Design an enzyme around this catalytic site. Structure first.
Site, PDB file in Angstrom:
ATOM      1  N   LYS A   1       0.835  -1.195   0.000  1.00 53.46           N
ATOM      2  CA  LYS A   1       0.000   0.000   0.000  1.00 53.46           C
ATOM      3  C   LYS A   1       0.870   1.246   0.000  1.00 53.46           C
ATOM      4  CE  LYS A   1      -1.847  -1.869   3.628  1.00 53.46           C
ATOM      5  NZ  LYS A   1      -2.610  -2.007   4.898  1.00 53.46           N
TER       6      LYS A   1
ATOM      7  N   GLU B   1       1.308   5.613  10.784  1.00 50.01           N
ATOM      8  CA  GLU B   1       2.279   5.102   9.830  1.00 50.01           C
ATOM      9  C   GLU B   1       3.675   5.260  10.417  1.00 50.01           C
ATOM     10  OE1 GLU B   1       2.431   7.304   6.148  1.00 50.01           O
ATOM     11  OE2 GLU B   1       3.583   8.898   7.121  1.00 50.01           O
ATOM     12  N   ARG B   2       4.643   4.588   9.802  1.00 49.11           N
ATOM     13  CA  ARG B   2       5.993   4.589  10.345  1.00 49.11           C
ATOM     14  C   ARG B   2       6.677   5.943  10.163  1.00 49.11           C
ATOM     15  NH1 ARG B   2       5.748  -0.853   7.673  1.00 49.11           N
ATOM     16  NH2 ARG B   2       7.107  -0.218   5.943  1.00 49.11           N
TER      17      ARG B   2
HETATM   18  N1  LIG Z   1       6.842  -2.721  -6.533  1.00 56.00           N
HETATM   19  C1  LIG Z   1       7.165  -3.767  -5.580  1.00 56.00           C
HETATM   20  N2  LIG Z   1       7.819  -4.717  -6.221  1.00 56.00           N
HETATM   21  C2  LIG Z   1       8.235  -5.808  -5.557  1.00 56.00           C
HETATM   22  N3  LIG Z   1       7.982  -5.932  -4.237  1.00 56.00           N
HETATM   23  C3  LIG Z   1       7.313  -4.960  -3.578  1.00 56.00           C
HETATM   24  C4  LIG Z   1       6.906  -3.891  -4.229  1.00 56.00           C
HETATM   25  N4  LIG Z   1       6.271  -3.086  -3.348  1.00 56.00           N
HETATM   26  C5  LIG Z   1       6.294  -3.677  -2.150  1.00 56.00           C
HETATM   27  N5  LIG Z   1       6.938  -4.846  -2.274  1.00 56.00           N
HETATM   28  C6  LIG Z   1       6.889  -5.309  -1.034  1.00 56.00           C
HETATM   29  O1  LIG Z   1       5.733  -4.824  -0.180  1.00 56.00           O
HETATM   30  C7  LIG Z   1       6.179  -4.893   1.047  1.00 56.00           C
HETATM   31  C8  LIG Z   1       5.854  -3.643   1.803  1.00 56.00           C
HETATM   32  O2  LIG Z   1       4.727  -3.022   1.282  1.00 56.00           O
HETATM   33  P1  LIG Z   1       4.035  -1.829   2.194  1.00 56.00           P
HETATM   34  O3  LIG Z   1       2.769  -1.363   1.527  1.00 56.00           O
HETATM   35  O4  LIG Z   1       5.073  -0.791   2.520  1.00 56.00           O
HETATM   36  O5  LIG Z   1       3.622  -2.566   3.598  1.00 56.00           O
HETATM   37  P2  LIG Z   1       2.274  -2.179   4.446  1.00 56.00           P
HETATM   38  O6  LIG Z   1       1.059  -2.548   3.624  1.00 56.00           O
HETATM   39  O7  LIG Z   1       2.255  -2.959   5.747  1.00 56.00           O
HETATM   40  O8  LIG Z   1       2.260  -0.700   4.735  1.00 56.00           O
HETATM   41  C9  LIG Z   1       7.845  -5.072   0.972  1.00 56.00           C
HETATM   42  O9  LIG Z   1       8.207  -6.459   1.305  1.00 56.00           O
HETATM   43  C10 LIG Z   1       8.167  -4.820  -0.198  1.00 56.00           C
HETATM   44  O10 LIG Z   1       9.400  -5.610  -0.591  1.00 56.00           O
END
Ligand SMILES: Nc1ncnc2c1ncn2[C@@H]1O[C@H](COP(=O)(O)OP(=O)(O)O)[C@@H](O)[C@H]1O
Lengths: 52, 475
Positions: free
Chosen positions: B154, B180-181
């Protein structure tokens, strides 16, 4: 004339798949040179595989 | 008016006034305290007693401490001076660059725009992403939702949309962070000061000049109480209502983890004395959300585009919070872990995803038919999952095998490497236009790419890259 042997029940793995694959290969190879091809078969599986 | 603290329970404070009470939503300042503790009135109880929610921690309060009523609700500054700047819920900047020299202040709490002052005009957004540009087109001047669990992308998707929209927007924008972080908050601040979205200049004498910025920032994060997490979105909405009411401009509004707006209520109502609902949520779970969402609407003065990230606890989309939130959105994008475990990114489920701007009267007929054909294909592939898991692909007929092949191919083709992922993926980013996406989908449906492999569609953008990758993989 290509006689393709096959089964009538399913769950036979992919043996009829390989048969129909080889048959498609043979037909597409022999219809380029212009040899008129006819198809005889045994089983409904080859029919369902090569109908369309 | 002066008052006394009588009772303290976590994030709730009971106060006693002698002469005259304050109304509800009014702000109160605690005096015998280190920091500036602010309380927001919520209820009245009798005996000239008042219940309030604290915007900070209650460690150090005393039964007898003194409280001062400000006579009005919390007031956040507004203007072009909030641009290029971070601001907590009480308006205090935490950028360590000076105070906010704004003339006017707005209340955190405002009534929504009326029925007559609404304007539902169908527009589109150029996100550069294939899945949303094809199957869930985003509405210019409408609400957009990104539903997902934890670790599905996200925040990465929001950063990509920021990079692909806000820089190419021209108008203003706002970003709210609700639990959020702080790491990613600082990262966004630095990426904006890099890309010029924020233009900070250090005048002599330690002053600063944020002139040229095109994005405001509001941050109430995980290191904050519920009272300081359930009132940040309202601040951001005031900041955007100033723009789209007075300035008349079109604004963007990115919000991160709106779910916390409910979670806070869930960890507050129990202390406020309310009976819990099904899963401990509130009885006010629908009204407390609608009073927030109805302020987000295009009107005759300006426009708010909105992009909300919605948490999904325990990967359960039947929870009351997302269930209610589904009714308030103009566009939707549901990310999945089953699809993320396959390495597909963005992990968008194109069947749970939907939109209102997909009709043939908005997008063309070729777009509409391509989208509907893709949905039909993916549903026909979903319907075979059980029999494939038990028996295998060999049982299937040839039409079904062709369907499975094209469905896997279009799954892998609906994946895109973003620019912000380069740090942990290495591969450069790929912006993708809509007519290119549509031509590629048309060809994949027709059968002009069945000769290619399946791993040639993985992270390639258009089809020229896919064909070059199939060529290189032939070796
Ligand atoms: N474009 C991307 N391509 C490959 N892996 C991704 C991509 N975006 C996120 N990942 C993976 O998504 C995970 C984090 O997504 P994020 O939305 O920041 O977490 P959350 O939903 O808890 O906030 C990571 O492991 C990251 O490696």
């Amino acid at each position: 004339a290509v006689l393709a042997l096959s089964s009538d029940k399913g769950l036979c793995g992919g043996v009829n798949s390989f048969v129909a694959k080889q048959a498609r290969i043979v037909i597409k190879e022999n219809e380029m040179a212009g040899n008129a091809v006819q198809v005889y078969g045994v089983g409904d599986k080859i029919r369902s595989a090569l109908q369309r | 008016n002066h008052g006394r603290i009588t009772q303290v329970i976590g994030a709730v404070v009971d106060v006693h006034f002698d002469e005259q009470l304050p109304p509800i939503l009014n702000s109160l300042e605690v005096q015998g305290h280190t920091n500036r503790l602010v309380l927001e009135v919520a209820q009245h109880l009798g005996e000239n007693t008042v219940r309030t929610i604290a915007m900070d921690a209650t460690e150090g309060l005393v039964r007898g401490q003194k409280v001062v009523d400000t006579g009005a609700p919390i007031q956040v500054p507004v203007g072009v001076e909030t641009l290029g700047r971070i601001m907590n819920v009480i308006g205090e900047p935490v950028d360590e660059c000076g105070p906010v020299p704004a003339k006017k202040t707005y209340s955190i709490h405002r009534a929504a725009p009326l029925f007559a002052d609404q304007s539902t005009e169908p527009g589109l957004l150029q996100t550069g992403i294939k899945v949303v540009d094809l199957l869930a087109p985003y509405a210019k001047g409408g609400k957009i939702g990104l539903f997902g669990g934890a670790g599905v992308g996200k925040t990465v998707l929001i950063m990509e949309l920021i990079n692909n929209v806000a820089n190419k927007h021209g108008g203003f924008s706002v970003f709210a962070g609700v639990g959020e972080r702080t790491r990613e908050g600082n990262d966004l601040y630095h990426e904006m000061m890099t890309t010029g979205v924020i233009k900070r200049k250090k005048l002599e004498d330690g002053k600063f000049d944020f002139t040229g910025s095109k994005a405001a920032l509001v941050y109430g994060q995980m290191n904050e109480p519920p009272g300081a997490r359930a009132r940040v979105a309202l601040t951001a909405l005031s900041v955007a209502e100033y723009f789209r009411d007075e300035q008349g401009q079109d604004v963007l509004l990115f919000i991160d983890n709106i779910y916390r707006f409910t979670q806070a209520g869930s960890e507050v109502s129990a202390l406020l004395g309310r009976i819990p609902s099904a899963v401990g949520y509130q009885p006010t779970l629908a009204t407390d959300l609608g009073q927030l969402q109805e302020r987000i609407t295009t009107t005759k003065k300006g426009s708010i585009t909105s992009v909300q990230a919605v948490y999904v606890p325990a990967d359960d989309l039947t929870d009351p919070a997302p269930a209610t939130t589904f009714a308030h959105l103009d566009a939707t994008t549901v990310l999945s872990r089953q699809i993320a475990e396959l390495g597909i990114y963005p992990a968008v489920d194109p069947l749970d995803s939907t939109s209102r701007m997909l009709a043939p009267e908005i997008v063309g007929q070729e777009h509409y038919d391509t989208a509907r054909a893709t949905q039909k294909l993916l549903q026909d592939y979903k319907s075979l999952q059980d029999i494939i898991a038990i028996l295998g692909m060999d049982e299937l007929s040839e039409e079904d095998k062709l369907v499975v092949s094209r469905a896997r191919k279009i799954q892998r083709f609906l994946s895109q490497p973003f620019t912000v992922a380069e740090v942990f993926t290495g591969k450069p980013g790929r912006f993708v236009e809509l007519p290119e996406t549509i031509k590629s989908a048309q060809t994949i449906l027709r059968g002009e790419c069945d000769d290619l492999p399946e791993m040639a569609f993985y992270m390639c953008g258009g089809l020229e890259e896919v064909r070059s990758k199939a060529v290189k993989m032939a070796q």
